[PDB]
Amino acid sequence: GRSSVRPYLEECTRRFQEMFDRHVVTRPTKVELTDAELREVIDDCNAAVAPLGKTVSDERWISYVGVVLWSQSPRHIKDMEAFKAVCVLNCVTFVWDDMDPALHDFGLFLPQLRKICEKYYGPEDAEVAYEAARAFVTSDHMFRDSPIKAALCTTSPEQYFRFRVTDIGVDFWMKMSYPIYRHPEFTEHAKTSLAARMTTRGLTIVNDFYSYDREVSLGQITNCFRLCDVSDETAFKEFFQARLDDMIEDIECIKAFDQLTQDVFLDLIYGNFVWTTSNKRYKTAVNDVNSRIQ
Amino acid sequence: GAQDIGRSSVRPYLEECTRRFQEMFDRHVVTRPTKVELTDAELREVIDDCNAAVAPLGKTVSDERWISYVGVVLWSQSPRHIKDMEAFKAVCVLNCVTFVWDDMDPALHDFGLFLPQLRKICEKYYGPEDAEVAYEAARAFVTSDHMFRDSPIKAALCTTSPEQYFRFRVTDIGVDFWMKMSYPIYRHPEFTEHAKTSLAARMTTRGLTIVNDFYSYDREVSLGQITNCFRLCDVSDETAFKEFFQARLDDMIEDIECIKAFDQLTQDVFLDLIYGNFVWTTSNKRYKTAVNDVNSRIQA
Ligand SMILES: C=C(C)[C@@H]1CC[C@]2(C)C/C(F)=C(/C)CC/C=C(/C)CC[C@H]12
Ligand SMILES: C=C(C)[C@@H]1CC[C@]2(C)C/C(F)=C(\C)CC/C=C(/C)CC[C@H]12
Ligand SMILES: [Cl-]
Ligand SMILES: [Cl-]
Ligand SMILES: [Cl-]
Ligand SMILES: [K+]
Ligand SMILES: [K+]
Ligand SMILES: [Mg+2]
Ligand SMILES: [Mg+2]
Ligand SMILES: [Mg+2]
Ligand SMILES: [Mg+2]
Ligand SMILES: [Mg+2]
Ligand SMILES: [Mg+2]
Ligand SMILES: [Mg+2]
Ligand SMILES: [Mg+2]
Ligand SMILES: [Mg+2]
């Protein structure tokens, strides 16, 4: 009844895309990694999660990494070592997101994050990236079955998106991504988390729509469509339009930022959507790339 | 009289809004904030550090002005939970000297002179790790306050909706900075994590900002400052003002009721911050007249 948004899949996909075409216009661009670059990334990912004891397949890594390939801003890239770092860090904390909390070993995993950060970044940037990775994995862990999560995800969209600034990983993403661009304004917006606060709703509403069926099946409550009656087409449509309006208002305000920063913000939101709709992770509730790692 | 005088002041609403705020706190927070009493030695140690830090910028600040700045720390921390009084004094100093920065013409903003003083304060009162977090947060605040003077981003975030506006204020009202320099006071691991993710700041931004904005509106409008949520409604129209004000009270209440899901120590800290800021704001000459000897623009 409320267990699926499948009836709305085609209409909502078309409405998301129309919104992007009218308000962002320019398509996101996929970063093409060389084979050598992709192997270096996947090798670092496997090394980082090996102490945790679970095998991750190449195609699951590729499912995770696609968000970085599609949602950065390739024409503004300056530092491909920072880009590779974001690939690795994004992927290995994605595994953490998918893991049963019994597998979460901070003593084994935190040094791996530190190693990744020092390898690919300079001394100061490595500290910023590591703290943000540390804060993300700690947050994902401590909020599993937390009353705080229950209160923030069941009260209002406002409370929910406030939780997601950290929990969807976008604050972490900004703080590990600014070395890719070496653009002083973007670096400040990343470090104040204004960059994350501006892009949270656009990332989260899309992720939530397409991951609803999986999350509802697993008992995960971190999803804004749980705030509406999805079995009621009229109530769903009103809620979905309110969320579309949220995304538009953010995008229109993002266009007040400097031309480079606004490119990075918009490529992030629109790229996430392109990646989400072509990724098997977001298609069936349980499959070989989104199954709980138990 | 070409000016929109009718929209230039919330003075007609002063008594009724103050009473409504207080009723809200009494119904939803209940327990009073507690003022930290500093020794005369401690206070003088704080003020001498404050004067040392802003001396390179060229402007004298009176003890009365410092005391006007420092009261928010005295009233809005959580005395029952304090473990580290050196961290508390760091927050007194860091709060006060960045208040001066907030009040200064941007021509006085000298990062080369001022950033080393902030680093010196942090290195004096905190351990090495805590000092780096507090310095980064102070740096990011003073850089933000400077960057956004006359900025199109500020205009867009402050004139679109309450949601865009409060998103700006998570940094601009200084509360993220506040959390990241206050967690060493409490040495409470959950509070430290909520500080470092900025969830602490996000939970408390609206309660701090709505109160600050109401009582600093007249001064800010007279100085042409646009960072104030009541510029989003027509304060000259009583019906529209009261509808907007009720919407802001509802925002505060929703945050406070969600804050009550946090662990007991964290929620005490969050609620003392919001309610203490209200007690301080309503007792402080800074928030009583548009221009006076403690809130006037510090001019180049
Ligand atoms: C941050 C970005 C734009 C996107 C937004 C959706 C995301 C793919 C989903 C999710 F799985 C996260 C929370 C776990 C990993 C966190 C960061 C690194 C990645 C967070 C991901
Ligand atoms: C460095 C301090 C702490 C920063 C500096 C200027 C500030 C905007 C002043 C004002 F708005 C305060 C007294 C209300 C909220 C207090 C804290 C959370 C942060 C307050 C701010
Ligand atoms: Cl560096
Ligand atoms: Cl934030
Ligand atoms: Cl320390
Ligand atoms: K809306
Ligand atoms: K409201
Ligand atoms: Mg998650
Ligand atoms: Mg997940
Ligand atoms: Mg390095
Ligand atoms: Mg999801
Ligand atoms: Mg397969
Ligand atoms: Mg200010
Ligand atoms: Mg001010
Ligand atoms: Mg004000
Ligand atoms: Mg009028």
Side-chain angles (χ1 to χ4, degrees):
Chain A
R2 290 176 73 183
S3 87
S4 176
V5 291
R6 175 59 185 88
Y8 315 116
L9 191 51
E10 296 91 341
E11 296 153 289
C12 291
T13 302
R14 140 166 83 71
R15 292 296 281 95
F16 279 134
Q17 178 62 45
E18 188 194 26
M19 187 282 295
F20 283 118
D21 283 326
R22 302 205 142 174
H23 291 279
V24 180
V25 183
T26 88
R27 301 167 86 156
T29 319
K30 188 186 187 186
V31 167
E32 312 174 34
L33 287 181
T34 65
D35 295 338
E37 275 165 343
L38 188 67
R39 315 278 199 88
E40 177 186 15
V41 166
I42 288 176
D43 284 348
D44 281 352
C45 294
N46 278 321
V49 302
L52 295 179
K54 291 294 166 189
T55 306
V56 180
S57 74
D58 293 337
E59 85 179 342
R60 196 164 179 142
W61 288 128
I62 285 146
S63 173
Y64 291 144
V65 85
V67 65
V68 189
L69 299 189
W70 274 111
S71 319
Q72 293 287 346
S73 201
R75 291 163 172 188
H76 302 310
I77 289 165
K78 289 183 165 178
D79 183 343
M80 279 299 303
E81 295 300 316
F83 183 91
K84 282 181 307 190
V86 175
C87 292
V88 173
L89 293 163
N90 169 86
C91 284
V92 300
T93 60
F94 225 140
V95 168
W96 190 269
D97 186 80
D98 272 348
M99 280 178 160
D100 193 285
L103 294 167
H104 281 173
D105 192 316
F106 289 90
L108 297 164
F109 198 48
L110 288 191
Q112 298 302 297
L113 295 176
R114 177 55 99 177
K115 277 158 200 20
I116 294 149
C117 287
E118 302 291 348
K119 168 183 168 175
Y120 287 109
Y121 299 107
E124 304 175 284
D125 292 346
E127 287 197 79
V128 172
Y130 172 77
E131 162 64 16
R134 184 214 65 75
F136 171 74
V137 294
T138 302
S139 177
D140 175 68
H141 183 85
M142 64 182 278
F143 285 103
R144 307 293 187 97
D145 273 276
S146 160
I148 301 161
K149 182 158 96 184
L152 295 184
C153 296
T154 60
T155 294
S156 70
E158 289 73 6
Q159 302 296 332
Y160 168 74
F161 289 127
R162 186 179 299 174
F163 179 61
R164 289 292 245 158
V165 172
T166 298
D167 177 77
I168 205 169
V170 64
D171 190 46
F172 168 29
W173 175 285
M174 297 299 187
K175 288 167 177 178
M176 64 171 159
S177 290
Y178 77 77
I180 299 173
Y181 301 105
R182 283 200 229 110
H183 180 54
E185 293 98 302
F186 179 73
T187 295
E188 288 311 315
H189 299 313
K191 290 196 198 161
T192 63
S193 302
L194 182 59
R197 296 193 291 280
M198 291 306 301
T199 52
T200 290
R201 295 199 292 191
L203 294 170
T204 305
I205 289 155
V206 169
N207 181 281
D208 287 359
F209 182 73
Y210 295 99
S211 58
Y212 179 88
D213 283 40
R214 158 170 50 92
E215 289 168 3
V216 163
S217 82
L218 291 172
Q220 290 170 310
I221 67 164
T222 306
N223 190 305
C224 68
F225 291 97
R226 297 185 74 122
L227 288 170
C228 81
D229 180 8
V230 304
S231 79
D232 177 341
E233 161 161 41
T234 286
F236 177 81
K237 285 202 160 252
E238 291 182 331
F239 186 89
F240 186 85
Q241 183 69 56
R243 299 292 77 71
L244 270 189
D245 286 337
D246 288 347
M247 294 181 71
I248 290 163
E249 185 178 274
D250 293 348
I251 284 159
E252 288 307 315
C253 288
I254 282 168
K255 295 169 169 168
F257 289 72
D258 76 84
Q259 305 289 325
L260 196 147
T261 295
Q262 76 170 260
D263 281 352
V264 170
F265 290 181
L266 296 179
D267 281 341
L268 171 53
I269 299 167
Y270 188 5
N272 175 249
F273 170 64
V274 166
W275 165 72
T276 293
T277 50
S278 44
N279 189 339
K280 179 173 160 159
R281 174 177 186 81
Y282 299 106
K283 294 201 187 313
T284 63
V286 185
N287 62 42
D288 67 354
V289 296
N290 66 22
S291 68
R292 180 81 161 203
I293 308 180
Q294 262 141 179
Chain B
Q3 47 272 7
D4 193 348
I5 307 179
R7 223 172 150 185
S8 71
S9 186
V10 290
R11 170 60 183 89
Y13 309 122
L14 181 64
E15 296 88 343
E16 191 178 356
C17 293
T18 301
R19 167 172 50 85
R20 289 302 298 286
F21 281 133
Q22 181 63 49
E23 186 194 25
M24 188 281 298
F25 287 115
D26 285 331
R27 279 151 121 83
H28 296 276
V29 179
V30 181
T31 56
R32 304 195 203 193
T34 299
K35 191 189 184 177
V36 171
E37 284 297 333
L38 286 182
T39 63
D40 320 321
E42 276 160 336
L43 189 52
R44 185 88 162 196
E45 175 185 17
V46 164
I47 288 192
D48 293 342
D49 280 353
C50 293
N51 280 320
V54 306
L57 297 184
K59 302 294 213 150
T60 294
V61 189
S62 69
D63 288 355
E64 170 188 19
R65 191 159 187 143
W66 289 129
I67 285 172
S68 179
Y69 292 148
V70 78
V72 64
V73 187
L74 305 188
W75 273 108
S76 318
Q77 297 282 355
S78 206
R80 74 176 302 158
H81 298 302
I82 295 184
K83 303 290 191 64
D84 184 339
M85 278 294 312
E86 301 299 313
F88 181 90
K89 281 186 303 179
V91 177
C92 293
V93 177
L94 287 169
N95 169 84
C96 287
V97 299
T98 58
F99 253 119
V100 165
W101 188 271
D102 186 78
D103 274 340
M104 280 179 159
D105 183 290
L108 299 168
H109 286 172
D110 193 298
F111 289 87
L113 297 173
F114 197 48
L115 295 186
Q117 302 301 305
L118 295 174
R119 165 59 83 180
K120 275 134 194 210
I121 297 156
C122 292
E123 285 187 334
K124 165 182 173 173
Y125 289 103
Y126 300 106
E129 279 174 292
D130 293 343
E132 270 178 57
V133 176
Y135 174 74
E136 167 56 23
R139 183 212 65 75
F141 171 76
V142 297
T143 303
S144 180
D145 174 68
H146 185 75
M147 292 173 56
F148 286 107
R149 310 289 189 96
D150 295 302
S151 172
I153 299 160
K154 190 205 275 166
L157 293 186
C158 292
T159 61
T160 294
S161 71
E163 275 160 15
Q164 304 302 325
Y165 170 73
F166 290 124
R167 180 182 302 172
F168 182 58
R169 289 289 247 158
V170 175
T171 300
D172 177 76
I173 203 153
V175 62
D176 188 46
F177 166 28
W178 175 283
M179 296 297 185
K180 290 170 174 176
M181 62 166 158
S182 299
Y183 74 78
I185 296 169
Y186 302 104
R187 304 198 200 114
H188 184 54
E190 298 92 302
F191 178 81
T192 294
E193 289 310 316
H194 298 313
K196 290 185 191 172
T197 61
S198 304
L199 179 57
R202 296 193 293 281
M203 293 305 304
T204 52
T205 290
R206 294 200 289 194
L208 291 170
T209 303
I210 285 154
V211 165
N212 180 278
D213 286 353
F214 182 72
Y215 294 101
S216 59
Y217 183 86
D218 289 33
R219 160 174 43 91
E220 287 168 6
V221 159
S222 85
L223 297 181
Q225 297 170 300
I226 64 168
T227 305
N228 188 302
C229 68
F230 293 98
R231 297 180 74 115
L232 294 165
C233 72
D234 177 6
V235 313
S236 77
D237 168 354
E238 189 168 35
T239 297
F241 174 78
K242 293 261 94 195
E243 180 183 322
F244 187 88
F245 188 82
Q246 187 57 64
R248 300 291 75 74
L249 277 178
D250 291 339
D251 289 351
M252 294 182 72
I253 290 164
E254 190 175 81
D255 290 345
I256 283 159
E257 291 304 317
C258 287
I259 282 162
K260 285 173 187 173
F262 288 70
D263 73 84
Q264 186 58 55
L265 193 153
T266 298
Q267 75 175 257
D268 285 349
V269 173
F270 290 179
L271 297 178
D272 278 337
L273 174 55
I274 302 168
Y275 189 3
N277 176 70
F278 171 61
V279 170
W280 169 70
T281 296
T282 49
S283 304
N284 183 347
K285 165 154 70 132
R286 176 171 186 84
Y287 297 105
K288 299 193 186 300
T289 74
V291 181
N292 57 45
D293 43 344
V294 300
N295 70 19
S296 55
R297 178 77 150 219
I298 303 172
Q299 303 225 219

Short mmCIF file of all heavy atoms in Angstrom, two decimals, chain B residues 98-99 101-104 141 145 149 169 172 212 216 219-220 223 225 227 286-287 295 297, ligand 14:
data_model
loop_
_atom_site.label_atom_id
_atom_site.label_comp_id
_atom_site.label_asym_id
_atom_site.label_seq_id
_atom_site.Cartn_x
_atom_site.Cartn_y
_atom_site.Cartn_z
N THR B 98 35.07 38.52 17.72
CA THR B 98 34.37 38.41 16.44
C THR B 98 33.08 39.23 16.41
O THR B 98 32.62 39.60 15.33
CB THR B 98 34.10 36.95 16.07
OG1 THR B 98 33.33 36.33 17.08
CG2 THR B 98 35.41 36.18 15.88
N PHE B 99 32.51 39.57 17.59
CA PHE B 99 31.44 40.57 17.62
C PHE B 99 31.93 41.93 17.13
O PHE B 99 31.22 42.65 16.43
CB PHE B 99 30.88 40.73 19.03
CG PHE B 99 29.51 40.12 19.25
CD1 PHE B 99 29.35 39.12 20.18
CD2 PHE B 99 28.39 40.63 18.60
CE1 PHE B 99 28.11 38.60 20.47
CE2 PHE B 99 27.12 40.10 18.86
CZ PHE B 99 26.99 39.10 19.83
N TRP B 101 34.37 42.44 15.04
CA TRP B 101 34.46 42.22 13.59
C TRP B 101 33.11 42.38 12.90
O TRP B 101 33.00 43.07 11.88
CB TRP B 101 35.05 40.82 13.34
CG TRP B 101 35.39 40.47 11.89
CD1 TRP B 101 34.56 39.88 10.95
CD2 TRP B 101 36.66 40.63 11.23
NE1 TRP B 101 35.23 39.70 9.76
CE2 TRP B 101 36.53 40.12 9.92
CE3 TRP B 101 37.90 41.13 11.64
CZ2 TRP B 101 37.60 40.13 9.00
CZ3 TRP B 101 38.95 41.15 10.74
CH2 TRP B 101 38.80 40.64 9.43
N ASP B 102 32.04 41.81 13.51
CA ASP B 102 30.67 41.95 13.01
C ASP B 102 30.23 43.41 12.94
O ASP B 102 29.51 43.80 12.02
CB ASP B 102 29.72 41.15 13.92
CG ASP B 102 28.30 41.10 13.43
OD1 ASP B 102 28.05 40.31 12.49
OD2 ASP B 102 27.42 41.83 13.98
N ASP B 103 30.68 44.22 13.89
CA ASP B 103 30.26 45.62 14.00
C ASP B 103 31.14 46.58 13.20
O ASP B 103 30.82 47.77 13.13
CB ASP B 103 30.25 46.05 15.48
CG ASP B 103 28.93 45.71 16.18
OD1 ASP B 103 27.91 45.49 15.49
OD2 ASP B 103 28.93 45.66 17.43
N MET B 104 32.21 46.10 12.57
CA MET B 104 33.19 46.97 11.94
C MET B 104 32.89 47.23 10.47
O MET B 104 32.38 46.35 9.76
CB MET B 104 34.58 46.35 12.01
CG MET B 104 35.27 46.52 13.30
SD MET B 104 36.85 45.70 13.19
CE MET B 104 37.70 46.55 14.54
N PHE B 141 34.09 31.99 10.20
CA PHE B 141 33.09 33.00 10.52
C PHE B 141 33.53 34.39 10.04
O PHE B 141 32.77 35.09 9.36
CB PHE B 141 32.76 33.07 12.03
CG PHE B 141 31.91 34.25 12.34
CD1 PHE B 141 30.57 34.23 12.01
CD2 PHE B 141 32.47 35.44 12.79
CE1 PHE B 141 29.78 35.35 12.18
CE2 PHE B 141 31.69 36.57 12.96
CZ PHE B 141 30.34 36.53 12.67
N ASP B 145 31.59 36.69 7.36
CA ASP B 145 31.05 38.02 7.62
C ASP B 145 31.63 39.04 6.64
O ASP B 145 30.90 39.90 6.12
CB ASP B 145 31.31 38.43 9.06
CG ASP B 145 30.88 39.86 9.32
OD1 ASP B 145 29.67 40.12 9.28
OD2 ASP B 145 31.76 40.72 9.50
N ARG B 149 29.46 40.91 2.89
CA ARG B 149 29.04 42.32 2.89
C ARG B 149 28.77 42.75 1.46
O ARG B 149 29.58 42.50 0.56
CB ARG B 149 30.12 43.23 3.51
CG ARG B 149 30.67 42.81 4.84
CD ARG B 149 29.66 42.99 5.97
NE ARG B 149 30.31 42.78 7.26
CZ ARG B 149 30.80 43.74 8.04
NH1 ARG B 149 30.72 45.02 7.67
NH2 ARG B 149 31.37 43.42 9.19
N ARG B 169 22.02 31.73 7.90
CA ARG B 169 22.34 32.13 9.27
C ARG B 169 23.01 31.04 10.06
O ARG B 169 23.56 31.32 11.13
CB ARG B 169 21.06 32.61 9.97
CG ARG B 169 20.62 33.97 9.38
CD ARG B 169 21.64 35.06 9.84
NE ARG B 169 20.93 36.00 10.74
CZ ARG B 169 21.55 36.78 11.62
NH1 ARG B 169 22.87 36.73 11.72
NH2 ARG B 169 20.84 37.56 12.45
N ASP B 172 26.20 32.58 9.51
CA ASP B 172 26.33 34.02 9.69
C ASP B 172 25.96 34.47 11.09
O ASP B 172 26.51 35.46 11.56
CB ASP B 172 25.47 34.75 8.66
CG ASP B 172 25.54 36.25 8.87
OD1 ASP B 172 26.57 36.84 8.50
OD2 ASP B 172 24.59 36.83 9.46
N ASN B 212 17.19 37.16 17.85
CA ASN B 212 18.11 38.23 17.52
C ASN B 212 17.48 39.19 16.52
O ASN B 212 17.60 40.42 16.66
CB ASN B 212 19.44 37.67 16.95
CG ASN B 212 20.38 38.76 16.61
OD1 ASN B 212 20.29 39.35 15.55
ND2 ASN B 212 21.30 39.08 17.54
N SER B 216 17.02 43.22 16.98
CA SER B 216 18.02 44.03 16.28
C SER B 216 17.47 44.62 14.99
O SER B 216 18.20 45.33 14.29
CB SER B 216 19.31 43.21 16.00
OG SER B 216 19.04 42.05 15.22
N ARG B 219 17.81 48.68 14.52
CA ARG B 219 19.18 49.08 14.22
C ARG B 219 19.58 48.65 12.82
O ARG B 219 20.12 49.43 12.03
CB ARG B 219 20.15 48.48 15.25
CG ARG B 219 21.63 48.45 14.74
CD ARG B 219 22.68 47.99 15.77
NE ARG B 219 22.26 46.82 16.55
CZ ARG B 219 22.50 45.55 16.23
NH1 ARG B 219 23.18 45.25 15.13
NH2 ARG B 219 22.09 44.58 17.03
N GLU B 220 19.32 47.38 12.49
CA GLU B 220 19.75 46.87 11.19
C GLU B 220 19.08 47.61 10.04
O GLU B 220 19.74 47.92 9.03
CB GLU B 220 19.51 45.37 11.15
CG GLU B 220 20.57 44.71 12.07
CD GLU B 220 20.31 43.26 12.36
OE1 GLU B 220 19.35 42.73 11.77
OE2 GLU B 220 21.06 42.66 13.17
N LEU B 223 20.74 50.91 9.50
CA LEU B 223 22.07 50.79 8.91
C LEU B 223 22.06 50.15 7.51
O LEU B 223 23.14 49.92 6.94
CB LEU B 223 22.99 49.99 9.85
CG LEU B 223 23.23 50.65 11.20
CD1 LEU B 223 24.15 49.82 12.07
CD2 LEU B 223 23.79 52.04 10.99
N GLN B 225 21.27 47.12 6.75
CA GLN B 225 21.61 45.71 6.77
C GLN B 225 20.38 44.86 6.46
O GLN B 225 19.30 45.08 7.02
CB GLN B 225 22.21 45.33 8.13
CG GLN B 225 23.55 46.07 8.41
CD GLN B 225 24.06 45.92 9.84
OE1 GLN B 225 23.39 46.30 10.79
NE2 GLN B 225 25.27 45.37 9.99
N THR B 227 20.21 41.39 6.64
CA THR B 227 20.21 40.04 7.20
C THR B 227 19.27 40.00 8.41
O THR B 227 19.69 40.04 9.58
CB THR B 227 21.64 39.61 7.55
OG1 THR B 227 22.49 39.73 6.38
CG2 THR B 227 21.67 38.16 8.02
N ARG B 286 22.49 46.80 23.90
CA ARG B 286 22.71 46.57 22.47
C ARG B 286 21.42 46.45 21.68
O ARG B 286 21.35 46.87 20.52
CB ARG B 286 23.54 45.30 22.27
CG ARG B 286 23.73 44.94 20.79
CD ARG B 286 24.74 43.80 20.60
NE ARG B 286 25.00 43.59 19.18
CZ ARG B 286 25.89 44.30 18.46
NH1 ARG B 286 26.60 45.27 19.02
NH2 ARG B 286 26.06 44.02 17.16
N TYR B 287 20.38 45.87 22.28
CA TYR B 287 19.15 45.56 21.56
C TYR B 287 17.99 46.46 21.95
O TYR B 287 16.83 46.06 21.80
CB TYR B 287 18.81 44.09 21.79
CG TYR B 287 19.89 43.17 21.23
CD1 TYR B 287 20.77 42.53 22.08
CD2 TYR B 287 20.02 42.97 19.85
CE1 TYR B 287 21.77 41.70 21.59
CE2 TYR B 287 21.03 42.14 19.34
CZ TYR B 287 21.89 41.51 20.22
OH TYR B 287 22.90 40.69 19.77
N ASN B 295 26.36 49.56 20.31
CA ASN B 295 26.02 48.85 19.07
C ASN B 295 26.29 49.68 17.81
O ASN B 295 25.91 49.24 16.71
CB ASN B 295 24.56 48.38 19.09
CG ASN B 295 23.55 49.52 18.99
OD1 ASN B 295 23.88 50.62 18.56
ND2 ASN B 295 22.30 49.24 19.37
N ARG B 297 28.01 51.35 14.57
CA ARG B 297 28.99 50.90 13.59
C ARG B 297 30.38 51.40 13.96
O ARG B 297 30.58 52.60 14.21
CB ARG B 297 28.59 51.39 12.20
CG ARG B 297 29.56 51.02 11.13
CD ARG B 297 29.39 49.58 10.76
NE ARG B 297 29.74 49.38 9.36
CZ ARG B 297 29.09 48.56 8.54
NH1 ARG B 297 28.05 47.86 8.99
NH2 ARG B 297 29.48 48.45 7.27
MG MG C 14 25.45 42.27 13.43
#
